[PDB]
């Protein structure tokens, strides 16, 4: 879902994007070298969305220029969050052209098992919804690509069907 | 256990209204049959991915063998294609030299 | 390199991303729903809105309202899609009364997602967005009343419907039941706020049935009688009673015409001169009557039909104005009377007699 | 209206009579029976939920002192944020029927005194609670506490 | 023919409904006048059940007319979708052969995959 | 015409509703007076329930009369075939509509050349419908195709296609010169108008949007269908801001699969 | 040898879905000379779909027997000669790719030159 038509003239560049948006670069190559990089920063989020459709899950939130967190330098960041079909677990992902790929997986309480059990919670109804996030480091994980890794993660959070 | 059986069960149920011995009923029937078929297909997908992840993390040697096989095959693809370009290049070189 | 001015881009980003929530906050306040303050939820990147309680007046009895307000846990709202205008509200329910045959027999929390999206005129957090949410909540509650009643009455069953029908789909907004001795037919019940009625829809799923569901002839009567008294066991009993006769009725050639009166009172017309009335009854009973004779007078007849002499003896084989009283059959001879059989063109005996 | 005025007149001229039901039944049961046949065969949940759905920066719980199991409850708060220092507990009192009303904060002036940092926190606190609108919740006040502490820390350094 | 029958039949239905409602009101007031203590004459009672029977029979006739008209129009429209007589018969025979062949091919494939 | 079938079906539904309404009226009146706890509500509820049924009967009769004013003027085994055929095409018609949206494929691989007459006949087959559209083909340079498409008295489109794959589009007005001095097609030029440049950008986005992987005829068919909608330009306003002009420009955006006018700023 | 089997089973699943969609599309394309051709194509597609179902069943039966270790355990949170032989193929392949780059940039320059020179021969 990212595709560019570039049109090179005599001292300008014209860029048309697959969703109705036109930009005009210049004869300096830093501009064009940063443009493509800022677009390679959004590909990952749209990749996770198009697979959250295919493989069953359901998206809860999507933004492709977020409005919180630190301040980026080349472009602007993107984030999503997407729920298990059984409903219990959830994934969330953030990416940026400068500081990218910060993924976190979120659990139902009574399976984090180091949680200070608050006092007002006495029932077992409130021990089925979900509160604790827990960050997972991207490195040292199976799958060569970023998209490929996601496949092995969003399949391991599924009921033990073996 | 044997998800393939109910996979073809849903597949055959998708054709139930045709092989038998005014639009709302058929539309409802195809809606439920198709959604069930897609759900079973996605569950089979999930089982294969879980098994693949377990096997890959247990022993990467088979993954390495598959990588070797694909790299060799694509090597032959590149060699054959560059050979084809050279043959046609010689042909058109002589065609243009005949002038 | 240093010609980008990153701070202005960041301010425009957050301002555009965050200003949609202000209208929705103001509207949830304006319609008197108790919410919490708009707040970042979980991770820093995404904002969310949580609503503490749904409006008290939803139109059903207090006891249902309690059971509802002991099974809700959350009503969060979120934003998604391109151009930042799609809302998704999410509900989670505890102590599910009923199980399906889908893989929804798990640890008793059940998630339900509703989706709203305003038009390009009439802004993103307009009055209309909550109106549809309240309408969907009302529909969910009105279906939940009947679901609760059916779940309560389930353990006390006359044991005849236990092997007849099983529950297939329950999503708190649409109820899909599967019935038939081979589980070859399906019914769907769902409330809507457009007409303020229960819309029951029939369908055929399964490898053992006809080209249709053989119940579309009395769809209107079934809908009307369900709207009169919203009970599930009564409809199940009616379907069990009327499954057998309509299966043989629908195989008749179409001379013969079928007029569905009030349920279990089918009227068969031979061309434009003869009539027959068929009543279905519980415990394997069907009543056949001539129908061309008025039940209250003898001198006057019906407008467009004529009596059929000698019909009473023909009906009595299978067991003046003497044919005006019904004759009882036991759902077995009716098939032989209606099924096309070779002559003792594959013509049925009733067609032969009438001809 | 049209085509049915006689029925309306008959019903209105017949209503609130001791034998209306008998008259209607006796005049309308037989034809209906003949044509169709036989007839048909402590702590409120809102507080518990809102405590369950708060950020793990807070671990609010019941006050060891004061009364309990009533419409009015008392909570004591602790803040555990790696990026912020330690502050007074900032206890709260929740009245009965918490929805459609607002809770109140019990001020403790002597606790926040004797330190420029703590009284700066306190004056920012007073400013923010004067800036809070009506019908507010407790999570909003807790987030206001966290943000006021952060702003005071930023102003100090 | 059915359409003009409909136009002729509609006012009769309206008149039948009118007289049915009127006689219902008259019978109700007469019965409730018997029930309480005061007197009135009965005369032409014109019982309720006869009016119900007439209304139901006329509605059945109208329904039959509409069903016949719709069936005839649908049959004509569907037949027009698909000059010498034997060529027409041969075309019909070929069409039914093609339909039967398609149906039996689908059934044979369904039997082959499962069962 | 097929409107008579729908009219007859609605008449059947109306008469069934009328009969059901009469039966409901008489049954509800036969039921009698209920309890309804206190006395005052008991008085009002019966009257409120009784009025509604009669009002429904009157409304049904009125709408039935409105329809009446609206309306106007071996074999068996054959029919069994016909009523089967139309039952198949619809049955697949939904099934093809639901499976294409949820495409499960991940990659075309496992584990272009066309005759000129093919392209010519395909373009003629596109040209036969849409009478306002007129298409002219040429090949000044090699096997690449140059097509001039004229639309009404408004639009002139130049399309360069590389082996039936659409590659480049430039649109211009009516009075503007489209041919060069030599008389051939002018490929490299501009329309000298802001709105036409904006719609060239829109056409580039459209050609970048419609991309089937193995059916190339449907792609050009969809492109021509989308281009068809532009004939109505300058007569239709935006669906959001109401007015025609925004910053001096008329609505120049036609949404895909829902062909309605829009300003560029209105998205 | 088993991961390849899992990938093959997955691929056959997508082909099964695609063949079902193609069957429904082909049934849609039938409108009452060539009708026998379409019928033979339908028979071929159905029989190859049946063969695909048989192959999927065979793959599932083979891979089912050959889980000791569950999921959610191997996800890493915050808290011998094969390698040697692989490297040569990577380096060799990389070298081959580099060579292709030189040929490609050269051919594109040739086509650019011929375009520029031929554009203005008039
Ligand atoms: Zn506009």
PDB file of C-alpha atoms in Angstrom, chain F residues 5-225:
ATOM      1  CA  UNK F   5     -43.416  -7.692 -10.322  1.00  0.00           C
ATOM      2  CA  UNK F   6     -42.372  -5.529  -7.367  1.00  0.00           C
ATOM      3  CA  UNK F   7     -45.759  -3.776  -7.375  1.00  0.00           C
ATOM      4  CA  UNK F   8     -47.561  -7.133  -7.264  1.00  0.00           C
ATOM      5  CA  UNK F   9     -45.310  -8.381  -4.457  1.00  0.00           C
ATOM      6  CA  UNK F  10     -45.962  -5.203  -2.465  1.00  0.00           C
ATOM      7  CA  UNK F  11     -49.715  -5.601  -3.034  1.00  0.00           C
ATOM      8  CA  UNK F  12     -49.554  -9.184  -1.735  1.00  0.00           C
ATOM      9  CA  UNK F  13     -47.610  -8.026   1.323  1.00  0.00           C
ATOM     10  CA  UNK F  14     -50.105  -5.196   1.885  1.00  0.00           C
ATOM     11  CA  UNK F  15     -53.157  -7.467   1.753  1.00  0.00           C
ATOM     12  CA  UNK F  16     -51.502  -9.986   4.087  1.00  0.00           C
ATOM     13  CA  UNK F  17     -50.686  -7.125   6.466  1.00  0.00           C
ATOM     14  CA  UNK F  18     -54.296  -5.909   6.293  1.00  0.00           C
ATOM     15  CA  UNK F  19     -55.668  -9.353   7.157  1.00  0.00           C
ATOM     16  CA  UNK F  20     -53.159  -9.758   9.994  1.00  0.00           C
ATOM     17  CA  UNK F  21     -54.018  -6.280  11.293  1.00  0.00           C
ATOM     18  CA  UNK F  22     -57.754  -7.048  11.356  1.00  0.00           C
ATOM     19  CA  UNK F  23     -57.097 -10.316  13.192  1.00  0.00           C
ATOM     20  CA  UNK F  24     -54.807  -8.509  15.650  1.00  0.00           C
ATOM     21  CA  UNK F  25     -57.430  -5.810  16.259  1.00  0.00           C
ATOM     22  CA  UNK F  26     -60.171  -8.297  17.037  1.00  0.00           C
ATOM     23  CA  UNK F  27     -57.979 -10.560  19.190  1.00  0.00           C
ATOM     24  CA  UNK F  28     -56.611  -7.621  21.201  1.00  0.00           C
ATOM     25  CA  UNK F  29     -60.119  -6.278  21.780  1.00  0.00           C
ATOM     26  CA  UNK F  30     -61.288  -9.773  22.786  1.00  0.00           C
ATOM     27  CA  UNK F  31     -58.495 -10.077  25.368  1.00  0.00           C
ATOM     28  CA  UNK F  32     -60.092  -7.439  27.591  1.00  0.00           C
ATOM     29  CA  UNK F  33     -59.056  -5.165  30.409  1.00  0.00           C
ATOM     30  CA  UNK F  34     -55.768  -5.855  32.207  1.00  0.00           C
ATOM     31  CA  UNK F  35     -54.518  -4.955  35.717  1.00  0.00           C
ATOM     32  CA  UNK F  36     -51.595  -2.523  35.198  1.00  0.00           C
ATOM     33  CA  UNK F  37     -51.124  -2.109  38.981  1.00  0.00           C
ATOM     34  CA  UNK F  38     -52.667   1.297  39.833  1.00  0.00           C
ATOM     35  CA  UNK F  39     -56.041   2.426  38.515  1.00  0.00           C
ATOM     36  CA  UNK F  40     -54.966   5.485  36.507  1.00  0.00           C
ATOM     37  CA  UNK F  41     -52.462   3.613  34.344  1.00  0.00           C
ATOM     38  CA  UNK F  42     -55.009   0.833  33.855  1.00  0.00           C
ATOM     39  CA  UNK F  43     -57.419   3.364  32.344  1.00  0.00           C
ATOM     40  CA  UNK F  44     -54.920   4.904  29.921  1.00  0.00           C
ATOM     41  CA  UNK F  45     -53.104   1.749  28.769  1.00  0.00           C
ATOM     42  CA  UNK F  46     -56.176   0.034  27.305  1.00  0.00           C
ATOM     43  CA  UNK F  47     -57.201   3.095  25.279  1.00  0.00           C
ATOM     44  CA  UNK F  48     -53.632   3.665  24.074  1.00  0.00           C
ATOM     45  CA  UNK F  49     -53.327   0.040  22.944  1.00  0.00           C
ATOM     46  CA  UNK F  50     -56.751   0.079  21.277  1.00  0.00           C
ATOM     47  CA  UNK F  51     -56.163   3.262  19.261  1.00  0.00           C
ATOM     48  CA  UNK F  52     -52.869   2.069  17.748  1.00  0.00           C
ATOM     49  CA  UNK F  53     -54.300  -1.038  16.081  1.00  0.00           C
ATOM     50  CA  UNK F  54     -57.085   0.905  14.353  1.00  0.00           C
ATOM     51  CA  UNK F  55     -54.604   3.583  13.271  1.00  0.00           C
ATOM     52  CA  UNK F  56     -52.397   0.845  11.797  1.00  0.00           C
ATOM     53  CA  UNK F  57     -55.379  -0.602   9.908  1.00  0.00           C
ATOM     54  CA  UNK F  58     -56.225   2.822   8.468  1.00  0.00           C
ATOM     55  CA  UNK F  59     -52.592   3.444   7.481  1.00  0.00           C
ATOM     56  CA  UNK F  60     -52.349   0.049   5.775  1.00  0.00           C
ATOM     57  CA  UNK F  61     -55.572   0.662   3.847  1.00  0.00           C
ATOM     58  CA  UNK F  62     -54.362   4.131   2.815  1.00  0.00           C
ATOM     59  CA  UNK F  63     -51.018   2.826   1.542  1.00  0.00           C
ATOM     60  CA  UNK F  64     -52.784  -0.044  -0.241  1.00  0.00           C
ATOM     61  CA  UNK F  65     -54.980   2.511  -2.025  1.00  0.00           C
ATOM     62  CA  UNK F  66     -51.876   4.569  -2.841  1.00  0.00           C
ATOM     63  CA  UNK F  67     -50.350   1.485  -4.473  1.00  0.00           C
ATOM     64  CA  UNK F  68     -53.632   0.849  -6.306  1.00  0.00           C
ATOM     65  CA  UNK F  69     -53.345   4.357  -7.733  1.00  0.00           C
ATOM     66  CA  UNK F  70     -49.690   3.596  -8.534  1.00  0.00           C
ATOM     67  CA  UNK F  71     -50.141   0.199 -10.212  1.00  0.00           C
ATOM     68  CA  UNK F  72     -51.150  -0.357 -13.818  1.00  0.00           C
ATOM     69  CA  UNK F  73     -51.183  -2.810 -16.693  1.00  0.00           C
ATOM     70  CA  UNK F  74     -42.945 -32.177 -20.629  1.00  0.00           C
ATOM     71  CA  UNK F  75     -43.613 -28.469 -20.116  1.00  0.00           C
ATOM     72  CA  UNK F  76     -43.316 -28.735 -16.326  1.00  0.00           C
ATOM     73  CA  UNK F  77     -39.895 -30.394 -16.560  1.00  0.00           C
ATOM     74  CA  UNK F  78     -38.977 -27.467 -18.821  1.00  0.00           C
ATOM     75  CA  UNK F  79     -39.980 -24.925 -16.166  1.00  0.00           C
ATOM     76  CA  UNK F  80     -38.102 -26.901 -13.509  1.00  0.00           C
ATOM     77  CA  UNK F  81     -35.003 -26.212 -15.606  1.00  0.00           C
ATOM     78  CA  UNK F  82     -35.659 -22.473 -15.941  1.00  0.00           C
ATOM     79  CA  UNK F  83     -36.359 -21.860 -12.249  1.00  0.00           C
ATOM     80  CA  UNK F  84     -33.067 -23.661 -11.596  1.00  0.00           C
ATOM     81  CA  UNK F  85     -30.870 -21.615 -13.939  1.00  0.00           C
ATOM     82  CA  UNK F  86     -31.692 -18.242 -12.381  1.00  0.00           C
ATOM     83  CA  UNK F  87     -31.162 -19.923  -8.996  1.00  0.00           C
ATOM     84  CA  UNK F  88     -27.538 -20.687  -9.929  1.00  0.00           C
ATOM     85  CA  UNK F  89     -26.294 -17.348 -11.277  1.00  0.00           C
ATOM     86  CA  UNK F  90     -27.469 -15.485  -8.175  1.00  0.00           C
ATOM     87  CA  UNK F  91     -26.104 -18.189  -5.855  1.00  0.00           C
ATOM     88  CA  UNK F  92     -22.601 -17.823  -7.289  1.00  0.00           C
ATOM     89  CA  UNK F  93     -23.034 -14.059  -7.654  1.00  0.00           C
ATOM     90  CA  UNK F  94     -22.921 -13.584  -3.893  1.00  0.00           C
ATOM     91  CA  UNK F  95     -20.220 -16.228  -3.427  1.00  0.00           C
ATOM     92  CA  UNK F  96     -17.880 -14.484  -5.866  1.00  0.00           C
ATOM     93  CA  UNK F  97     -18.586 -11.170  -4.129  1.00  0.00           C
ATOM     94  CA  UNK F  98     -17.617 -12.412  -0.662  1.00  0.00           C
ATOM     95  CA  UNK F  99     -14.450 -14.366  -1.550  1.00  0.00           C
ATOM     96  CA  UNK F 100     -12.711 -11.647  -3.576  1.00  0.00           C
ATOM     97  CA  UNK F 101     -12.833  -9.150  -0.693  1.00  0.00           C
ATOM     98  CA  UNK F 102     -11.196 -11.621   1.728  1.00  0.00           C
ATOM     99  CA  UNK F 103      -8.239 -12.683  -0.404  1.00  0.00           C
ATOM    100  CA  UNK F 104      -6.049 -15.211   1.419  1.00  0.00           C
ATOM    101  CA  UNK F 105      -3.178 -15.337  -1.091  1.00  0.00           C
ATOM    102  CA  UNK F 106       0.253 -14.136   0.018  1.00  0.00           C
ATOM    103  CA  UNK F 107       2.404 -14.410  -3.113  1.00  0.00           C
ATOM    104  CA  UNK F 108       1.924 -15.169  -6.801  1.00  0.00           C
ATOM    105  CA  UNK F 109       4.966 -17.448  -7.065  1.00  0.00           C
ATOM    106  CA  UNK F 110       4.891 -21.084  -5.953  1.00  0.00           C
ATOM    107  CA  UNK F 111       7.190 -22.595  -3.316  1.00  0.00           C
ATOM    108  CA  UNK F 112       2.928  -9.953 -21.160  1.00  0.00           C
ATOM    109  CA  UNK F 113       3.310 -10.369 -24.921  1.00  0.00           C
ATOM    110  CA  UNK F 114      -0.002  -9.998 -26.772  1.00  0.00           C
ATOM    111  CA  UNK F 115      -0.922  -9.610 -30.444  1.00  0.00           C
ATOM    112  CA  UNK F 116      -1.726  -6.030 -31.510  1.00  0.00           C
ATOM    113  CA  UNK F 117      -5.136  -7.147 -32.784  1.00  0.00           C
ATOM    114  CA  UNK F 118      -5.993  -8.290 -29.250  1.00  0.00           C
ATOM    115  CA  UNK F 119      -5.416  -4.792 -27.862  1.00  0.00           C
ATOM    116  CA  UNK F 120      -7.203  -3.186 -30.815  1.00  0.00           C
ATOM    117  CA  UNK F 121     -10.315  -5.351 -30.421  1.00  0.00           C
ATOM    118  CA  UNK F 122     -10.323  -4.879 -26.635  1.00  0.00           C
ATOM    119  CA  UNK F 123     -10.214  -1.096 -27.064  1.00  0.00           C
ATOM    120  CA  UNK F 124     -12.977  -1.254 -29.686  1.00  0.00           C
ATOM    121  CA  UNK F 125     -15.058  -3.391 -27.309  1.00  0.00           C
ATOM    122  CA  UNK F 126     -14.562  -0.689 -24.687  1.00  0.00           C
ATOM    123  CA  UNK F 127     -15.502   1.937 -27.280  1.00  0.00           C
ATOM    124  CA  UNK F 128     -18.813   0.341 -28.307  1.00  0.00           C
ATOM    125  CA  UNK F 129     -20.534   1.361 -25.070  1.00  0.00           C
ATOM    126  CA  UNK F 130     -20.347   4.807 -23.437  1.00  0.00           C
ATOM    127  CA  UNK F 131     -21.495   6.695 -26.566  1.00  0.00           C
ATOM    128  CA  UNK F 132     -20.111  10.023 -25.312  1.00  0.00           C
ATOM    129  CA  UNK F 133     -16.585   8.576 -25.123  1.00  0.00           C
ATOM    130  CA  UNK F 134     -14.685   8.502 -28.410  1.00  0.00           C
ATOM    131  CA  UNK F 135     -11.331   6.706 -28.633  1.00  0.00           C
ATOM    132  CA  UNK F 136      -8.697   6.933 -31.387  1.00  0.00           C
ATOM    133  CA  UNK F 137      -5.604   4.708 -31.463  1.00  0.00           C
ATOM    134  CA  UNK F 138      -2.171   5.274 -32.981  1.00  0.00           C
ATOM    135  CA  UNK F 139       1.379   3.902 -32.794  1.00  0.00           C
ATOM    136  CA  UNK F 140       3.757   6.661 -33.962  1.00  0.00           C
ATOM    137  CA  UNK F 141       6.724   5.087 -32.131  1.00  0.00           C
ATOM    138  CA  UNK F 142       7.214   1.324 -31.895  1.00  0.00           C
ATOM    139  CA  UNK F 143       4.661  -0.974 -30.293  1.00  0.00           C
ATOM    140  CA  UNK F 144       3.633   1.520 -27.591  1.00  0.00           C
ATOM    141  CA  UNK F 145       0.011   2.641 -27.884  1.00  0.00           C
ATOM    142  CA  UNK F 146      -1.121   6.283 -27.929  1.00  0.00           C
ATOM    143  CA  UNK F 147      -4.854   6.809 -27.415  1.00  0.00           C
ATOM    144  CA  UNK F 148      -6.813  10.054 -27.709  1.00  0.00           C
ATOM    145  CA  UNK F 149     -10.121   9.931 -25.820  1.00  0.00           C
ATOM    146  CA  UNK F 150     -12.576  12.797 -26.262  1.00  0.00           C
ATOM    147  CA  UNK F 151     -15.358  13.328 -23.711  1.00  0.00           C
ATOM    148  CA  UNK F 152     -18.299  15.533 -24.650  1.00  0.00           C
ATOM    149  CA  UNK F 153     -17.312  19.125 -25.315  1.00  0.00           C
ATOM    150  CA  UNK F 154     -15.139  19.249 -22.180  1.00  0.00           C
ATOM    151  CA  UNK F 155     -12.312  16.720 -22.002  1.00  0.00           C
ATOM    152  CA  UNK F 156      -9.461  15.451 -24.189  1.00  0.00           C
ATOM    153  CA  UNK F 157      -7.260  12.703 -22.714  1.00  0.00           C
ATOM    154  CA  UNK F 158      -3.936  11.427 -24.062  1.00  0.00           C
ATOM    155  CA  UNK F 159      -3.020   7.959 -22.788  1.00  0.00           C
ATOM    156  CA  UNK F 160       0.282   6.184 -23.421  1.00  0.00           C
ATOM    157  CA  UNK F 161       0.060   2.443 -22.735  1.00  0.00           C
ATOM    158  CA  UNK F 162       2.942  -0.056 -22.793  1.00  0.00           C
ATOM    159  CA  UNK F 163       1.629  -3.392 -24.128  1.00  0.00           C
ATOM    160  CA  UNK F 164      -1.982  -2.834 -22.948  1.00  0.00           C
ATOM    161  CA  UNK F 165      -0.706  -1.763 -19.500  1.00  0.00           C
ATOM    162  CA  UNK F 166      -1.708   1.858 -18.918  1.00  0.00           C
ATOM    163  CA  UNK F 167       1.387   3.947 -18.231  1.00  0.00           C
ATOM    164  CA  UNK F 168       0.833   7.698 -18.589  1.00  0.00           C
ATOM    165  CA  UNK F 169      -2.120  10.086 -18.862  1.00  0.00           C
ATOM    166  CA  UNK F 170      -2.411  13.809 -19.608  1.00  0.00           C
ATOM    167  CA  UNK F 171      -5.767  15.586 -19.903  1.00  0.00           C
ATOM    168  CA  UNK F 172      -6.673  18.944 -21.464  1.00  0.00           C
ATOM    169  CA  UNK F 173      -9.742  21.022 -22.229  1.00  0.00           C
ATOM    170  CA  UNK F 174     -11.704  21.197 -25.479  1.00  0.00           C
ATOM    171  CA  UNK F 175     -10.436  24.303 -27.307  1.00  0.00           C
ATOM    172  CA  UNK F 176      -6.776  23.611 -26.482  1.00  0.00           C
ATOM    173  CA  UNK F 177      -4.571  22.351 -29.311  1.00  0.00           C
ATOM    174  CA  UNK F 178      -3.746  18.661 -28.884  1.00  0.00           C
ATOM    175  CA  UNK F 179      -1.711  17.987 -32.049  1.00  0.00           C
ATOM    176  CA  UNK F 180       1.811  19.205 -32.767  1.00  0.00           C
ATOM    177  CA  UNK F 181       3.003  21.259 -35.744  1.00  0.00           C
ATOM    178  CA  UNK F 182       3.897  18.097 -37.681  1.00  0.00           C
ATOM    179  CA  UNK F 183       0.389  16.750 -37.014  1.00  0.00           C
ATOM    180  CA  UNK F 184       1.314  13.853 -34.718  1.00  0.00           C
ATOM    181  CA  UNK F 185       0.204  13.422 -31.113  1.00  0.00           C
ATOM    182  CA  UNK F 186       1.854  15.744 -28.589  1.00  0.00           C
ATOM    183  CA  UNK F 187       2.892  13.592 -25.629  1.00  0.00           C
ATOM    184  CA  UNK F 188       5.001  16.017 -23.556  1.00  0.00           C
ATOM    185  CA  UNK F 189       2.956  19.150 -22.820  1.00  0.00           C
ATOM    186  CA  UNK F 190       0.846  20.725 -20.081  1.00  0.00           C
ATOM    187  CA  UNK F 191      -2.771  21.858 -19.974  1.00  0.00           C
ATOM    188  CA  UNK F 192      -2.019  25.465 -18.885  1.00  0.00           C
ATOM    189  CA  UNK F 193      -4.879  25.227 -16.357  1.00  0.00           C
ATOM    190  CA  UNK F 194      -4.801  24.535 -12.623  1.00  0.00           C
ATOM    191  CA  UNK F 195      -7.929  22.353 -12.543  1.00  0.00           C
ATOM    192  CA  UNK F 196      -6.684  20.210 -15.424  1.00  0.00           C
ATOM    193  CA  UNK F 197      -3.314  19.750 -13.707  1.00  0.00           C
ATOM    194  CA  UNK F 198      -5.115  18.697 -10.519  1.00  0.00           C
ATOM    195  CA  UNK F 199      -7.205  16.169 -12.432  1.00  0.00           C
ATOM    196  CA  UNK F 200      -4.068  14.871 -14.187  1.00  0.00           C
ATOM    197  CA  UNK F 201      -2.736  14.205 -10.688  1.00  0.00           C
ATOM    198  CA  UNK F 202      -6.055  12.542  -9.832  1.00  0.00           C
ATOM    199  CA  UNK F 203      -5.843  10.360 -12.954  1.00  0.00           C
ATOM    200  CA  UNK F 204      -2.277   9.373 -12.053  1.00  0.00           C
ATOM    201  CA  UNK F 205      -3.464   8.356  -8.584  1.00  0.00           C
ATOM    202  CA  UNK F 206      -6.372   6.437 -10.143  1.00  0.00           C
ATOM    203  CA  UNK F 207      -4.091   4.512 -12.508  1.00  0.00           C
ATOM    204  CA  UNK F 208      -1.811   3.800  -9.544  1.00  0.00           C
ATOM    205  CA  UNK F 209      -4.870   2.517  -7.630  1.00  0.00           C
ATOM    206  CA  UNK F 210      -6.557   0.107 -10.077  1.00  0.00           C
ATOM    207  CA  UNK F 211      -4.016  -2.746 -10.215  1.00  0.00           C
ATOM    208  CA  UNK F 212      -5.170  -6.338 -10.776  1.00  0.00           C
ATOM    209  CA  UNK F 213      -2.386  -8.973 -10.796  1.00  0.00           C
ATOM    210  CA  UNK F 214      -3.543 -11.277 -13.614  1.00  0.00           C
ATOM    211  CA  UNK F 215      -6.648  -9.697 -15.203  1.00  0.00           C
ATOM    212  CA  UNK F 216      -5.522  -6.652 -17.241  1.00  0.00           C
ATOM    213  CA  UNK F 217      -8.780  -6.018 -19.140  1.00  0.00           C
ATOM    214  CA  UNK F 218     -10.800  -5.247 -16.006  1.00  0.00           C
ATOM    215  CA  UNK F 219      -8.167  -2.644 -15.081  1.00  0.00           C
ATOM    216  CA  UNK F 220      -8.685  -0.600 -18.249  1.00  0.00           C
ATOM    217  CA  UNK F 221     -12.446  -1.168 -17.994  1.00  0.00           C
ATOM    218  CA  UNK F 222     -12.457   0.276 -14.465  1.00  0.00           C
ATOM    219  CA  UNK F 223     -10.251   3.176 -15.560  1.00  0.00           C
ATOM    220  CA  UNK F 224     -12.637   4.014 -18.412  1.00  0.00           C
ATOM    221  CA  UNK F 225     -15.648   3.718 -16.090  1.00  0.00           C
TER     222      UNK F 225
END
